[PDB]
Amino acid sequence: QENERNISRLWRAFRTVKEMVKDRGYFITQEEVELPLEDFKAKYCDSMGRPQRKMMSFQANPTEESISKFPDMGSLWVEFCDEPSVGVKTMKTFVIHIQEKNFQTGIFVYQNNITPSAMKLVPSIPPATIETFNEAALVVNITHHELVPKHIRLSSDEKRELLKRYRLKESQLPRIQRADPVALYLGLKRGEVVKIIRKSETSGRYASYRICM
Amino acid sequence: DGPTMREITETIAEAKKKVLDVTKEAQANLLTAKHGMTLRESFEDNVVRFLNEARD
Amino acid sequence: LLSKVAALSGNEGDASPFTDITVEGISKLLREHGYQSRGFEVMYNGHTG
Amino acid sequence: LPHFSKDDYSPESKGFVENSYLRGLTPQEFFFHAMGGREGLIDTAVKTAETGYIQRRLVKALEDIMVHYDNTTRNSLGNVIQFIYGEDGMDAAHIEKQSLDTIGGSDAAFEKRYRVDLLNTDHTLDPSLLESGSEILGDLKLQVLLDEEYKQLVKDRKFLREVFVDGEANWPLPVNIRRIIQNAQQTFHIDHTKPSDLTIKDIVLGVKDLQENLLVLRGKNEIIQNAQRDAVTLFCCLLRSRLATRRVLQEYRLTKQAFDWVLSNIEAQFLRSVVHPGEM
Amino acid sequence: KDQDDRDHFGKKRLDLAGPLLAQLFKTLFKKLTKDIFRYMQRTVEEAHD
Amino acid sequence: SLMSCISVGTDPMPIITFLSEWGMEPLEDYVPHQSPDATRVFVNGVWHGVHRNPARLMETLRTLRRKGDINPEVSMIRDIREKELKIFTDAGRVYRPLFIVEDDESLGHKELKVRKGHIAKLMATEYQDDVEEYTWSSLLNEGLVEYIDAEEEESILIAMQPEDLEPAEVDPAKRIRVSHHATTFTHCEIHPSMILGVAASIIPFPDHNQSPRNTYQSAMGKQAMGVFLTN
Amino acid sequence: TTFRFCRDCNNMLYPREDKENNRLLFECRTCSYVEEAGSPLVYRHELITNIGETAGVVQDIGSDPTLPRSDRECPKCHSRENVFFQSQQRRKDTSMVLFFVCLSCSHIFTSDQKNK
Amino acid sequence: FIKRDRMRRNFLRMREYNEFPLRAIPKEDLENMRTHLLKFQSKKKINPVTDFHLPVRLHRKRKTRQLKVLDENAKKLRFEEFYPWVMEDFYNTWVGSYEAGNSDSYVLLSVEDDGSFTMIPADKVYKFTARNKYATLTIDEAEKRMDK
Amino acid sequence: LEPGHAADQEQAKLIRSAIEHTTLKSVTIASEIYYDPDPRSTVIPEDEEIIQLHFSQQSPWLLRLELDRAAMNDKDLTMGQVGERIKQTFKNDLFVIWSEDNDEKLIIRCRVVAEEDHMLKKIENTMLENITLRGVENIERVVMMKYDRKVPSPTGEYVKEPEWVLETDGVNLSEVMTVPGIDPTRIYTNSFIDIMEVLGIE
Numbered sequence A: 001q002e003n004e005r006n007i008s009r010l011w012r013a014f015r016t017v018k019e020m021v022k023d024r025g026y027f028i029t030q031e032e033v034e035l036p037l038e039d040f041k042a043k044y045c046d047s048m049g050r051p052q053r054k055m056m057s058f059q060a061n062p063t064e065e066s067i068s069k070f071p072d073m074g075s076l077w078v079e080f081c082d083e084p085s086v087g088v089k090t091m092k093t094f095v096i097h098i099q100e101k102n103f104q105t106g107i108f109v110y111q112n113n114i115t116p117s118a119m120k121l122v123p124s125i126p127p128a129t130i131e132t133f134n135e136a137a138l139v140v141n142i143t144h145h146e147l148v149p150k151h152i153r154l155s156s157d158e159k160r161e162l163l164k165r166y167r168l169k170e171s172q173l174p175r176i177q178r179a180d181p182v183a184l185y186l187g188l189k190r191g192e193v194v195k196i197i198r199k200s201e202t203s204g205r206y207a208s209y210r211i212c213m
Numbered sequence B: 001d002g003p004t005m006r007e008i009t010e011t012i013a014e015a016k017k018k019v020l021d022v023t024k025e026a027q028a029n030l031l032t033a034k035h036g037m038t039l040r041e042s043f044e045d046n047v048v049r050f051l052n053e054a055r056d
Numbered sequence C: 001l002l003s004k005v006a007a008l009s010g011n012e013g014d015a016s017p018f019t020d021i022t023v024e025g026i027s028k029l030l031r032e033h034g035y036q037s038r039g040f041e042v043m044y045n046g047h048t049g
Numbered sequence D: 001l002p003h004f005s006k007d008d009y010s011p012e013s014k015g016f017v018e019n020s021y022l023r024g025l026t027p028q029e030f031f032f033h034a035m036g037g038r039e040g041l042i043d044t045a046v047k048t049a050e051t052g053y054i055q056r057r058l059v060k061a062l063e064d065i066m067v068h069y070d071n072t073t074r075n076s077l078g079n080v081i082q083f084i085y086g087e088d089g090m091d092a093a094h095i096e097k098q099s100l101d102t103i104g105g106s107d108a109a110f111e112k113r114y115r116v117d118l119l120n121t122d123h124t125l126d127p128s129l130l131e132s133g134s135e136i137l138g139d140l141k142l143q144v145l146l147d148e149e150y151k152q153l154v155k156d157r158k159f160l161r162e163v164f165v166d167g168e169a170n171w172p173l174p175v176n177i178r179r180i181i182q183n184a185q186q187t188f189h190i191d192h193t194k195p196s197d198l199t200i201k202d203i204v205l206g207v208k209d210l211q212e213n214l215l216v217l218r219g220k221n222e223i224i225q226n227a228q229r230d231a232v233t234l235f236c237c238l239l240r241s242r243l244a245t246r247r248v249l250q251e252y253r254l255t256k257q258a259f260d261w262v263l264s265n266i267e268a269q270f271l272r273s274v275v276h277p278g279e280m
Numbered sequence E: 001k002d003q004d005d006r007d008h009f010g011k012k013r014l015d016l017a018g019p020l021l022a023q024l025f026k027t028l029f030k031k032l033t034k035d036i037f038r039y040m041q042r043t044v045e046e047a048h049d
Numbered sequence F: 001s002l003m004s005c006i007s008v009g010t011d012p013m014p015i016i017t018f019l020s021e022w023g024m025e026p027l028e029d030y031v032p033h034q035s036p037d038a039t040r041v042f043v044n045g046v047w048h049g050v051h052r053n054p055a056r057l058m059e060t061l062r063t064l065r066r067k068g069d070i071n072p073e074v075s076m077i078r079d080i081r082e083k084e085l086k087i088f089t090d091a092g093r094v095y096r097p098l099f100i101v102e103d104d105e106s107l108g109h110k111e112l113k114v115r116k117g118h119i120a121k122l123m124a125t126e127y128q129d130d131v132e133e134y135t136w137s138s139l140l141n142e143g144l145v146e147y148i149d150a151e152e153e154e155s156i157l158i159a160m161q162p163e164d165l166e167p168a169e170v171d172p173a174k175r176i177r178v179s180h181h182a183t184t185f186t187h188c189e190i191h192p193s194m195i196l197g198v199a200a201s202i203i204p205f206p207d208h209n210q211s212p213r214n215t216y217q218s219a220m221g222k223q224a225m226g227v228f229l230t231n
Numbered sequence G: 001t002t003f004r005f006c007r008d009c010n011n012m013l014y015p016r017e018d019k020e021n022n023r024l025l026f027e028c029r030t031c032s033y034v035e036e037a038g039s040p041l042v043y044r045h046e047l048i049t050n051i052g053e054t055a056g057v058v059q060d061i062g063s064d065p066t067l068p069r070s071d072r073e074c075p076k077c078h079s080r081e082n083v084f085f086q087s088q089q090r091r092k093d094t095s096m097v098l099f100f101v102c103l104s105c106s107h108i109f110t111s112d113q114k115n116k
Numbered sequence H: 001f002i003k004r005d006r007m008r009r010n011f012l013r014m015r016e017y018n019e020f021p022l023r024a025i026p027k028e029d030l031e032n033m034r035t036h037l038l039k040f041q042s043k044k045k046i047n048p049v050t051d052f053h054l055p056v057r058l059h060r061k062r063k064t065r066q067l068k069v070l071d072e073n074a075k076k077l078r079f080e081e082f083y084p085w086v087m088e089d090f091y092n093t094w095v096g097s098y099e100a101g102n103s104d105s106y107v108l109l110s111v112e113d114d115g116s117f118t119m120i121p122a123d124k125v126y127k128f129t130a131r132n133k134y135a136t137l138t139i140d141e142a143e144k145r146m147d148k
Numbered sequence I: 001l002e003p004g005h006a007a008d009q010e011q012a013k014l015i016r017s018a019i020e021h022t023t024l025k026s027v028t029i030a031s032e033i034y035y036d037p038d039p040r041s042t043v044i045p046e047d048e049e050i051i052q053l054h055f056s057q058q059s060p061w062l063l064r065l066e067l068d069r070a071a072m073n074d075k076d077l078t079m080g081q082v083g084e085r086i087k088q089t090f091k092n093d094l095f096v097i098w099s100e101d102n103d104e105k106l107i108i109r110c111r112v113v114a115e116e117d118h119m120l121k122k123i124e125n126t127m128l129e130n131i132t133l134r135g136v137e138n139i140e141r142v143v144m145m146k147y148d149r150k151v152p153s154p155t156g157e158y159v160k161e162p163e164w165v166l167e168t169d170g171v172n173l174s175e176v177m178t179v180p181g182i183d184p185t186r187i188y189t190n191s192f193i194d195i196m197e198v199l200g201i202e
């Protein structure tokens, strides 16, 4: 019943997560993404059958090519949360633990909602950041949708080349907003340029450039 | 030409006849409306359908 | 057309909107005066005759 | 109308008009038809009055945007809107519908058209097509070229499938090719039943070369050349299809001067089809 | 019952010259009357003429 | 429209008075539960009371209008389903004349009250210029023709042509018509063409034109040249 | 639903549970008047409502000239002279089922062959 | 087909019981007294004043030269009589109100011991509330409670 | 719908059943309130069968209501799953009974553990309006449409391939997007504002 269905939703979302994490350039194998629902249920569901999220939380490491292009990029930690509404104390734990392991970024998935205090404490560890996603929001990866053309984040060197070649100021680029689902998805930050390849019905391949607000 | 005229005439008349039958049916509550469409909606919809078909 | 008849017969026509006057009725009247019953008429070009 | 008893849904009552204008209308018909006409005059006045006030907004918003020499389409502030006008850089005046031959057709008929294999007996050219076809037969250097070419076309079909989902084979593109061929044929009196003097290395290297002389963005660097390619991508895919070796020799029977002059013109008109910077 | 129709013509009254001149002439004659009264106050309170 | 006219209105008092004498119960005695079926009675939106026999009442009134006792302009209505009888002596209503059809006859079915005798009695007047000058006022006092507003137009039923649609029962050229099946016609239209205004009246055969070409003609006909006045 | 009124207060009676006898009464809060209930029923909403369809039938309805006439015979008196009209309730989903009204016995009988 | 105007030429070429008397009282009595109907809203049908007990009573409960606005005699007199009457024992209380529309035509027929009658014209007509039945006067306090 | 199930009409009907907003008022013919002090025994002679079955301290007031069987059909429902819904709505404060599908008259009765009526009649509204029986909110009148779809053949030319597609009135994109059994990739709405919100700027 409801238990089973909830398991299903949680699984699909979990798939989405790995997908995004690979897209950011962290190493996960195709099969590791493609692990079927039955295997996942056995791996993280208890003998009663209820799933265990605290077992699901896991580390992501950068792919070699990624280290090559973005040397600064560090490893990532992913937590889920079992609490339906996330407590500030749990948030504190996540903050501390990440600072402990010295990851460059962190990701926290919540079930329903989080106390405003916990949200306020999120920007407390520069340069490290905390991306916060809702479980129910991640159920379906958006990028697989037809209307969403492929995105690519860029290296500053590549960027300075872009601006120089078109003779542009950053302001003059078409702008994209941080709250954008895609922006969240790739975990963009301000002044970071993305490339978009949209398939055109006139040119047939049309590049484009945008810059987070 | 006349033979065409009478042919048009009947071609309309039968259309009216169909409409009349739809009327009798729905008056007798024997008509079942298309889902999402109210009964009288489905009625008008049909009647107009027949009519434009006739004119064409 | 109706005018063309009124012209010939010397009786003004009744154009009143809703009546029993019918095109065929006119056509017959006109034919009686010897013109083509639909009002078409043979014309010659002015330049070349 | 007062002339009908209550709850009369017959189409005579609710306004069906049976008589044609030639026969005239009964009065309760006429009145209805006047109601319809009035609706037609009213809405027409509204649409006109409103549509103009849209025309003004669309103008005032878009009035400042022009196409700079760099071919970026960018408004007053210098803000980049499009990195290449219309994404292919082509003036809407010069563009025509054209048939994409690669996108449509069955697997088999497609291969039957574009595939040329000298080693296998199925798809080999008839030698009388071109003067040297006999000695050409079986030669490996050429068969390899044709292999690369054919693979190119196939992978292009894989592409166009991904671009156009429904696979509509007709799209606006510059430079009507069909008319160029026809003009050339009639021009030089291309004579069927006689062998061509075209070599295959002549054909393939002719096309692959001509592709390089189609230019929109003339900048020299990685980024620009990336755009230049992504700009001419589709049009190229059309071109290869129309100039495919089989299609050239079997159908058009072009001679040397014919095929040359065609390559020349295709590029010549092409460059005319690029937008003129300074355009508003 | 249906929502009442605002455009039912039997519920619209037309106003020709008569009703118009009635309205306007009313407010004129009020203004007139009132002015005569003011004049009476001025002459009686001031005892002139 | 040509025959349309605007009501100049009259005084309600004589009507309101007249009602009570014929048995209208004054409002203040009304006990809704005890007299459930009585038709309540409006005059110019003012509700003065009720009446228990609207049928006969409404007959009395209509008879008075047709005698010309009440000014014909007054428009009375009886809504059967609503249990209301409305009256308007008010000014500013619009009304058009019609023939009054009557079932009451020596012979069979219903017929218009106007008959040839009246007609010749009119054209005697017209062609003349014998006595008493039988004219529109006469036609209205004798109850042949009656004025009807849009309100009273609710409760009646109208026939387009007298001799087409009155009697109970085809070349291909003529237009197709409806039937006479309705036996209740209370009123018959004088002539349908009169639904046209002045501008349209000049259009020949406007039935055969698409409507907007009638409109454009209605406007353009106003600016044409032509002799405007003899003087 | 069919609520009564007080005596000499005339006001509507609000239902009062009797906890002593565990039975229902009717109180008038303006006075001491209370009387017994006649049914356990108190409130009925009736979302789907078929009443009002036949509304507006009047003793004089047979005199209405604007109403059409029909030749169908009455099931009771078998008089073929009758007047018909559609459901008086005005709503989108209101069916077009006719209501035939005889001019002899005044009886109301529908045209619906599905449900009667 | 055409319009016929030759109608000048056409019209010229064609043309046990019991009988009890009634009387109008000497007006002196009328001069002394005005007569007024009584009506109750009770719904309690009986309501004879005998039932109403007793003791019965029935009783009603510097500028410079400037402008006055004009008014009628009958209306002014009626308006000046705005203290309505009332009746009690020493408690049941009825409060009346001028009907105002029914003066109209009302003729009184008094049944006297002999079958003959006397007839007096009706002055006014009043409608008596039975007032203060449940006897809660909640006034300003009630409005304040309403402000909840 | 997903490509595998695109041809099936009945799977489609399942999804329509899984989205279109369903309210208790939609299926409710009428409701009525009764005074029945004894919790177990009911004065009503008809319902005594229900008393006999569905049984084998609480409010003296009864709330009772009747459903359209046609509504139970057009919108597929089960008297049980309904009573499930209400039970898991109000939890234990309101006892619940419901009649069988076999019953020619669909009946539902409920009671509760100082002017009780207004509180009960209040709860009646929460029942009709505030209970979403099943499906996604804001959506109405989901229409099955057979749309032809151009799809490559195994032999490579295109083939017109009819498939069942659900048009929809009202828009909530996120949830509908998440519902299992559909194809999240091709989902579409005609209001771009939401496309912007959910799927971003591009």
Ligand SMILES: [Zn+2]
Pocket: G006, G007, G008, G009, G010, G011, G028, G029, G030, G031, G032, G033
């Ligand atoms: Zn009371």
Ligand SMILES: [Zn+2]
Pocket: G074, G075, G076, G077, G078, G079, G102, G103, G104, G105, G106, G107
């Ligand atoms: Zn009968």
